[PDB]
Amino acid sequence: KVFGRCELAAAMKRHGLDNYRGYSLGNWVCAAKFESNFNSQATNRNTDGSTDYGVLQINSRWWCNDGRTPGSRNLCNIPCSALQSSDITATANCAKKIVSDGDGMNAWVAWRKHCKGTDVRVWIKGCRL
Protein backbone atom coordinates (compact mmCIF):
# COMPACT_ATOMS: atom_id res chain seq x y z
CA LYS A 1 0.00 0.00 0.00
CA VAL A 2 1.38 3.49 -0.65
CA PHE A 3 0.44 5.61 2.33
CA GLY A 4 -0.41 9.25 2.01
CA ARG A 5 1.76 11.49 4.22
CA CYS A 6 -1.02 12.40 6.67
CA GLU A 7 -2.42 8.86 6.55
CA LEU A 8 0.90 7.44 7.70
CA ALA A 9 1.40 10.21 10.31
CA ALA A 10 -1.96 9.49 11.95
CA ALA A 11 -1.32 5.73 11.94
CA MET A 12 2.12 6.19 13.58
CA LYS A 13 0.59 8.55 16.12
CA ARG A 14 -2.06 5.88 16.97
CA HIS A 15 0.75 3.42 17.65
CA GLY A 16 2.71 5.60 20.11
CA LEU A 17 5.55 6.83 17.88
CA ASP A 18 4.97 10.53 18.61
CA ASN A 19 7.98 11.57 20.72
CA TYR A 20 8.85 7.92 21.47
CA ARG A 21 12.15 8.24 23.28
CA GLY A 22 12.18 11.95 22.44
CA TYR A 23 11.82 11.41 18.64
CA SER A 24 8.84 13.49 17.52
CA LEU A 25 6.21 12.24 14.97
CA GLY A 26 7.65 14.34 12.08
CA ASN A 27 10.94 12.43 12.44
CA TRP A 28 9.28 9.05 11.83
CA VAL A 29 7.29 10.39 8.89
CA CYS A 30 10.37 12.01 7.28
CA ALA A 31 12.40 8.82 7.67
CA ALA A 32 9.63 6.72 6.00
CA LYS A 33 9.49 9.13 3.01
CA PHE A 34 13.19 8.80 2.32
CA GLU A 35 13.46 5.08 3.20
CA SER A 36 10.50 3.72 1.20
CA ASN A 37 8.62 6.65 -0.34
CA PHE A 38 5.73 5.55 1.94
CA ASN A 39 5.42 2.21 0.13
CA SER A 40 4.73 -0.77 2.47
CA GLN A 41 5.67 -3.22 -0.32
CA ALA A 42 9.11 -1.67 -1.06
CA THR A 43 11.84 -4.28 -0.63
CA ASN A 44 15.59 -3.93 -1.06
CA ARG A 45 17.58 -7.11 -1.50
CA ASN A 46 21.09 -6.94 -0.12
CA THR A 47 24.34 -8.66 -1.19
CA ASP A 48 24.39 -10.88 1.88
CA GLY A 49 20.97 -12.26 0.91
CA SER A 50 18.89 -10.24 3.40
CA THR A 51 16.06 -7.95 2.29
CA ASP A 52 14.73 -4.71 3.76
CA TYR A 53 10.98 -4.56 4.23
CA GLY A 54 8.15 -2.10 4.72
CA VAL A 55 7.93 1.68 5.16
CA LEU A 56 11.06 1.79 7.34
CA GLN A 57 13.06 -0.81 5.38
CA ILE A 58 13.74 -3.14 8.26
CA ASN A 59 16.29 -5.91 7.59
CA SER A 60 15.66 -9.72 7.58
CA ARG A 61 19.11 -10.79 8.92
CA TRP A 62 18.41 -9.31 12.34
CA TRP A 63 14.87 -8.07 12.87
CA CYS A 64 12.26 -10.19 11.06
CA ASN A 65 12.11 -13.73 9.62
CA ASP A 66 11.40 -13.94 5.88
CA GLY A 67 12.22 -17.68 5.61
CA ARG A 68 14.80 -16.81 2.90
CA THR A 69 17.66 -15.20 4.84
CA PRO A 70 20.75 -17.22 5.86
CA GLY A 71 21.04 -16.91 9.58
CA SER A 72 18.09 -14.65 10.51
CA ARG A 73 18.00 -13.84 14.22
CA ASN A 74 14.45 -12.30 14.21
CA LEU A 75 14.77 -9.88 17.17
CA CYS A 76 11.29 -8.37 16.56
CA ASN A 77 9.82 -11.87 16.52
CA ILE A 78 7.70 -11.29 13.42
CA PRO A 79 7.55 -12.64 9.85
CA CYS A 80 8.84 -9.95 7.46
CA SER A 81 5.45 -10.03 5.67
CA ALA A 82 3.91 -8.35 8.76
CA LEU A 83 5.96 -5.25 7.78
CA GLN A 84 4.32 -5.19 4.32
CA SER A 85 0.80 -4.96 5.65
CA SER A 86 -1.42 -1.88 5.43
CA ASP A 87 -1.62 -2.29 9.21
CA ILE A 88 1.33 -0.39 10.68
CA THR A 89 1.21 -2.28 14.06
CA ALA A 90 4.16 -4.63 13.47
CA THR A 91 6.23 -1.84 11.90
CA ALA A 92 5.57 0.41 14.93
CA ASN A 93 6.46 -2.31 17.49
CA CYS A 94 9.61 -3.39 15.70
CA ALA A 95 10.79 0.23 15.07
CA LYS A 96 10.41 0.77 18.84
CA LYS A 97 12.77 -2.16 19.42
CA ILE A 98 15.31 -0.84 16.92
CA VAL A 99 15.42 2.64 18.50
CA SER A 100 15.59 1.47 22.12
CA ASP A 101 19.13 -0.02 21.90
CA GLY A 102 21.45 1.39 19.25
CA ASP A 103 22.22 4.80 17.91
CA GLY A 104 18.50 5.84 18.23
CA MET A 105 17.16 7.03 14.88
CA ASN A 106 20.64 7.04 13.38
CA ALA A 107 19.80 3.46 12.50
CA TRP A 108 18.11 4.88 9.33
CA VAL A 109 20.76 6.51 7.17
CA ALA A 110 18.18 8.37 5.06
CA TRP A 111 16.88 9.95 8.29
CA ARG A 112 20.42 11.21 9.13
CA LYS A 113 20.74 12.67 5.64
CA HIS A 114 17.36 14.24 5.19
CA CYS A 115 15.63 14.78 8.49
CA LYS A 116 18.01 15.07 11.42
CA GLY A 117 18.80 18.67 12.34
CA THR A 118 15.99 20.21 10.20
CA ASP A 119 12.44 21.21 11.17
CA VAL A 120 10.34 18.05 10.79
CA ARG A 121 7.00 19.56 12.02
CA VAL A 122 6.48 20.48 8.34
CA TRP A 123 6.15 16.72 7.62
CA ILE A 124 2.85 16.63 9.54
CA LYS A 125 1.66 20.10 8.61
CA GLY A 126 -1.86 20.09 7.23
CA CYS A 127 -2.60 16.71 8.87
CA ARG A 128 -4.51 18.26 11.80
CA LEU A 129 -2.54 16.24 14.35
Side-chain angles (χ1 to χ4, degrees), residues 69-90:
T69 297
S72 168
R73 309 295 301 197
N74 199 195
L75 299 162
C76 290
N77 217 115
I78 48 170
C80 299
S81 57
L83 306 175
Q84 299 179 122
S85 182
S86 51
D87 189 349
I88 205 71
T89 305

PDB file of all heavy atoms in Angstrom, residues 69-90:
ATOM      1  N   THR A  69      16.433 -15.882   4.500  1.00  0.00           N
ATOM      2  CA  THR A  69      17.663 -15.203   4.841  1.00  0.00           C
ATOM      3  C   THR A  69      18.552 -16.117   5.650  1.00  0.00           C
ATOM      4  O   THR A  69      18.153 -16.592   6.718  1.00  0.00           O
ATOM      5  CB  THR A  69      17.390 -13.870   5.557  1.00  0.00           C
ATOM      6  OG1 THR A  69      16.685 -13.128   4.564  1.00  0.00           O
ATOM      7  CG2 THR A  69      18.638 -13.128   5.992  1.00  0.00           C
ATOM      8  N   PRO A  70      19.751 -16.423   5.152  1.00  0.00           N
ATOM      9  CA  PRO A  70      20.747 -17.216   5.863  1.00  0.00           C
ATOM     10  C   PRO A  70      21.041 -16.559   7.200  1.00  0.00           C
ATOM     11  O   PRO A  70      21.451 -15.405   7.287  1.00  0.00           O
ATOM     12  CB  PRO A  70      21.947 -17.150   4.943  1.00  0.00           C
ATOM     13  CG  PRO A  70      21.315 -17.038   3.571  1.00  0.00           C
ATOM     14  CD  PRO A  70      20.243 -15.996   3.839  1.00  0.00           C
ATOM     15  N   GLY A  71      20.658 -17.288   8.237  1.00  0.00           N
ATOM     16  CA  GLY A  71      21.041 -16.910   9.582  1.00  0.00           C
ATOM     17  C   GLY A  71      20.243 -15.765  10.171  1.00  0.00           C
ATOM     18  O   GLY A  71      20.822 -15.013  10.948  1.00  0.00           O
ATOM     19  N   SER A  72      18.943 -15.639   9.861  1.00  0.00           N
ATOM     20  CA  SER A  72      18.088 -14.650  10.505  1.00  0.00           C
ATOM     21  C   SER A  72      17.991 -14.863  12.016  1.00  0.00           C
ATOM     22  O   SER A  72      17.752 -15.987  12.479  1.00  0.00           O
ATOM     23  CB  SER A  72      16.682 -14.649   9.867  1.00  0.00           C
ATOM     24  OG  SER A  72      15.673 -13.906  10.578  1.00  0.00           O
ATOM     25  N   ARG A  73      18.168 -13.785  12.781  1.00  0.00           N
ATOM     26  CA  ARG A  73      17.998 -13.837  14.218  1.00  0.00           C
ATOM     27  C   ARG A  73      16.598 -13.436  14.674  1.00  0.00           C
ATOM     28  O   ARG A  73      16.225 -13.704  15.816  1.00  0.00           O
ATOM     29  CB  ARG A  73      18.988 -12.924  14.920  1.00  0.00           C
ATOM     30  CG  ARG A  73      20.455 -13.053  14.542  1.00  0.00           C
ATOM     31  CD  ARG A  73      21.137 -14.363  14.882  1.00  0.00           C
ATOM     32  NE  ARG A  73      21.120 -14.678  16.302  1.00  0.00           N
ATOM     33  CZ  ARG A  73      21.942 -15.597  16.827  1.00  0.00           C
ATOM     34  NH1 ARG A  73      22.924 -16.151  16.105  1.00  0.00           N
ATOM     35  NH2 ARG A  73      21.745 -15.976  18.088  1.00  0.00           N
ATOM     36  N   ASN A  74      15.807 -12.735  13.854  1.00  0.00           N
ATOM     37  CA  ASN A  74      14.446 -12.299  14.210  1.00  0.00           C
ATOM     38  C   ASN A  74      14.188 -11.646  15.585  1.00  0.00           C
ATOM     39  O   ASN A  74      13.293 -12.018  16.344  1.00  0.00           O
ATOM     40  CB  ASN A  74      13.460 -13.448  13.974  1.00  0.00           C
ATOM     41  CG  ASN A  74      11.997 -13.051  13.845  1.00  0.00           C
ATOM     42  OD1 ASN A  74      11.099 -13.883  13.921  1.00  0.00           O
ATOM     43  ND2 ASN A  74      11.601 -11.816  13.617  1.00  0.00           N
ATOM     44  N   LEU A  75      14.894 -10.560  15.892  1.00  0.00           N
ATOM     45  CA  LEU A  75      14.772  -9.876  17.172  1.00  0.00           C
ATOM     46  C   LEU A  75      13.397  -9.254  17.389  1.00  0.00           C
ATOM     47  O   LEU A  75      12.966  -9.131  18.530  1.00  0.00           O
ATOM     48  CB  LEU A  75      15.890  -8.830  17.327  1.00  0.00           C
ATOM     49  CG  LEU A  75      17.331  -9.358  17.317  1.00  0.00           C
ATOM     50  CD1 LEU A  75      18.333  -8.262  17.042  1.00  0.00           C
ATOM     51  CD2 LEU A  75      17.668 -10.082  18.594  1.00  0.00           C
ATOM     52  N   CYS A  76      12.651  -8.864  16.354  1.00  0.00           N
ATOM     53  CA  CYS A  76      11.294  -8.373  16.557  1.00  0.00           C
ATOM     54  C   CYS A  76      10.254  -9.472  16.641  1.00  0.00           C
ATOM     55  O   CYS A  76       9.074  -9.194  16.859  1.00  0.00           O
ATOM     56  CB  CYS A  76      10.878  -7.398  15.481  1.00  0.00           C
ATOM     57  SG  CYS A  76      11.781  -5.840  15.631  1.00  0.00           S
ATOM     58  N   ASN A  77      10.688 -10.721  16.454  1.00  0.00           N
ATOM     59  CA  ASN A  77       9.819 -11.874  16.524  1.00  0.00           C
ATOM     60  C   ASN A  77       8.560 -11.792  15.659  1.00  0.00           C
ATOM     61  O   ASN A  77       7.422 -12.018  16.073  1.00  0.00           O
ATOM     62  CB  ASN A  77       9.495 -12.166  17.970  1.00  0.00           C
ATOM     63  CG  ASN A  77       9.447 -13.667  18.146  1.00  0.00           C
ATOM     64  OD1 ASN A  77      10.288 -14.200  18.868  1.00  0.00           O
ATOM     65  ND2 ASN A  77       8.544 -14.434  17.528  1.00  0.00           N
ATOM     66  N   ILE A  78       8.771 -11.443  14.397  1.00  0.00           N
ATOM     67  CA  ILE A  78       7.696 -11.292  13.421  1.00  0.00           C
ATOM     68  C   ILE A  78       8.140 -11.867  12.092  1.00  0.00           C
ATOM     69  O   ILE A  78       9.348 -11.846  11.798  1.00  0.00           O
ATOM     70  CB  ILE A  78       7.312  -9.807  13.172  1.00  0.00           C
ATOM     71  CG1 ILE A  78       8.534  -8.914  12.931  1.00  0.00           C
ATOM     72  CG2 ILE A  78       6.390  -9.306  14.273  1.00  0.00           C
ATOM     73  CD1 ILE A  78       8.185  -7.511  12.437  1.00  0.00           C
ATOM     74  N   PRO A  79       7.241 -12.375  11.245  1.00  0.00           N
ATOM     75  CA  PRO A  79       7.548 -12.638   9.851  1.00  0.00           C
ATOM     76  C   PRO A  79       7.728 -11.301   9.129  1.00  0.00           C
ATOM     77  O   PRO A  79       6.985 -10.341   9.388  1.00  0.00           O
ATOM     78  CB  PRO A  79       6.312 -13.371   9.371  1.00  0.00           C
ATOM     79  CG  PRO A  79       5.199 -12.872  10.245  1.00  0.00           C
ATOM     80  CD  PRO A  79       5.899 -12.820  11.595  1.00  0.00           C
ATOM     81  N   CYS A  80       8.644 -11.199   8.174  1.00  0.00           N
ATOM     82  CA  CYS A  80       8.843  -9.949   7.462  1.00  0.00           C
ATOM     83  C   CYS A  80       7.594  -9.467   6.726  1.00  0.00           C
ATOM     84  O   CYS A  80       7.413  -8.266   6.514  1.00  0.00           O
ATOM     85  CB  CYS A  80      10.033 -10.027   6.517  1.00  0.00           C
ATOM     86  SG  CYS A  80      11.609 -10.355   7.353  1.00  0.00           S
ATOM     87  N   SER A  81       6.675 -10.378   6.376  1.00  0.00           N
ATOM     88  CA  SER A  81       5.453 -10.027   5.674  1.00  0.00           C
ATOM     89  C   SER A  81       4.548  -9.111   6.513  1.00  0.00           C
ATOM     90  O   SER A  81       3.850  -8.250   5.971  1.00  0.00           O
ATOM     91  CB  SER A  81       4.755 -11.335   5.249  1.00  0.00           C
ATOM     92  OG  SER A  81       4.504 -12.160   6.385  1.00  0.00           O
ATOM     93  N   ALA A  82       4.621  -9.232   7.841  1.00  0.00           N
ATOM     94  CA  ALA A  82       3.915  -8.345   8.758  1.00  0.00           C
ATOM     95  C   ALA A  82       4.277  -6.871   8.559  1.00  0.00           C
ATOM     96  O   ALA A  82       3.436  -5.987   8.738  1.00  0.00           O
ATOM     97  CB  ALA A  82       4.289  -8.699  10.187  1.00  0.00           C
ATOM     98  N   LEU A  83       5.512  -6.598   8.121  1.00  0.00           N
ATOM     99  CA  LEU A  83       5.955  -5.247   7.783  1.00  0.00           C
ATOM    100  C   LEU A  83       5.458  -4.759   6.424  1.00  0.00           C
ATOM    101  O   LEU A  83       5.625  -3.585   6.085  1.00  0.00           O
ATOM    102  CB  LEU A  83       7.471  -5.202   7.801  1.00  0.00           C
ATOM    103  CG  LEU A  83       8.136  -5.685   9.092  1.00  0.00           C
ATOM    104  CD1 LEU A  83       9.651  -5.706   8.929  1.00  0.00           C
ATOM    105  CD2 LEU A  83       7.722  -4.811  10.267  1.00  0.00           C
ATOM    106  N   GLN A  84       4.848  -5.630   5.597  1.00  0.00           N
ATOM    107  CA  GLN A  84       4.321  -5.193   4.317  1.00  0.00           C
ATOM    108  C   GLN A  84       2.835  -4.876   4.312  1.00  0.00           C
ATOM    109  O   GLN A  84       2.250  -4.429   3.319  1.00  0.00           O
ATOM    110  CB  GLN A  84       4.638  -6.208   3.275  1.00  0.00           C
ATOM    111  CG  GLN A  84       6.126  -6.360   3.154  1.00  0.00           C
ATOM    112  CD  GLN A  84       6.505  -7.390   2.122  1.00  0.00           C
ATOM    113  OE1 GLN A  84       7.214  -7.131   1.158  1.00  0.00           O
ATOM    114  NE2 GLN A  84       6.054  -8.623   2.294  1.00  0.00           N
ATOM    115  N   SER A  85       2.219  -5.096   5.458  1.00  0.00           N
ATOM    116  CA  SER A  85       0.796  -4.957   5.651  1.00  0.00           C
ATOM    117  C   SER A  85       0.362  -3.513   5.463  1.00  0.00           C
ATOM    118  O   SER A  85       1.194  -2.607   5.538  1.00  0.00           O
ATOM    119  CB  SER A  85       0.538  -5.386   7.090  1.00  0.00           C
ATOM    120  OG  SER A  85      -0.841  -5.351   7.443  1.00  0.00           O
ATOM    121  N   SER A  86      -0.923  -3.230   5.221  1.00  0.00           N
ATOM    122  CA  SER A  86      -1.418  -1.882   5.426  1.00  0.00           C
ATOM    123  C   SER A  86      -1.634  -1.545   6.915  1.00  0.00           C
ATOM    124  O   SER A  86      -1.935  -0.410   7.294  1.00  0.00           O
ATOM    125  CB  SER A  86      -2.678  -1.714   4.601  1.00  0.00           C
ATOM    126  OG  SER A  86      -3.616  -2.746   4.829  1.00  0.00           O
ATOM    127  N   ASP A  87      -1.552  -2.533   7.803  1.00  0.00           N
ATOM    128  CA  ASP A  87      -1.621  -2.293   9.210  1.00  0.00           C
ATOM    129  C   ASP A  87      -0.191  -2.047   9.676  1.00  0.00           C
ATOM    130  O   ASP A  87       0.657  -2.933   9.653  1.00  0.00           O
ATOM    131  CB  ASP A  87      -2.210  -3.512   9.929  1.00  0.00           C
ATOM    132  CG  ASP A  87      -2.539  -3.308  11.415  1.00  0.00           C
ATOM    133  OD1 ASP A  87      -2.148  -2.295  12.001  1.00  0.00           O
ATOM    134  OD2 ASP A  87      -3.200  -4.164  11.998  1.00  0.00           O
ATOM    135  N   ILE A  88       0.026  -0.844  10.209  1.00  0.00           N
ATOM    136  CA  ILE A  88       1.332  -0.391  10.679  1.00  0.00           C
ATOM    137  C   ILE A  88       1.760  -1.026  12.002  1.00  0.00           C
ATOM    138  O   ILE A  88       2.910  -0.847  12.403  1.00  0.00           O
ATOM    139  CB  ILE A  88       1.307   1.183  10.731  1.00  0.00           C
ATOM    140  CG1 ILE A  88       2.655   1.858  10.602  1.00  0.00           C
ATOM    141  CG2 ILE A  88       0.643   1.719  11.985  1.00  0.00           C
ATOM    142  CD1 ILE A  88       3.248   1.744   9.184  1.00  0.00           C
ATOM    143  N   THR A  89       0.906  -1.768  12.714  1.00  0.00           N
ATOM    144  CA  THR A  89       1.207  -2.275  14.059  1.00  0.00           C
ATOM    145  C   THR A  89       2.579  -2.943  14.206  1.00  0.00           C
ATOM    146  O   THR A  89       3.341  -2.593  15.118  1.00  0.00           O
ATOM    147  CB  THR A  89       0.111  -3.271  14.525  1.00  0.00           C
ATOM    148  OG1 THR A  89      -1.146  -2.595  14.434  1.00  0.00           O
ATOM    149  CG2 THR A  89       0.343  -3.767  15.945  1.00  0.00           C
ATOM    150  N   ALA A  90       2.926  -3.870  13.311  1.00  0.00           N
ATOM    151  CA  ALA A  90       4.157  -4.630  13.468  1.00  0.00           C
ATOM    152  C   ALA A  90       5.359  -3.749  13.151  1.00  0.00           C
ATOM    153  O   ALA A  90       6.408  -3.889  13.778  1.00  0.00           O
ATOM    154  CB  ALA A  90       4.172  -5.778  12.490  1.00  0.00           C
TER     155      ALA A  90
END
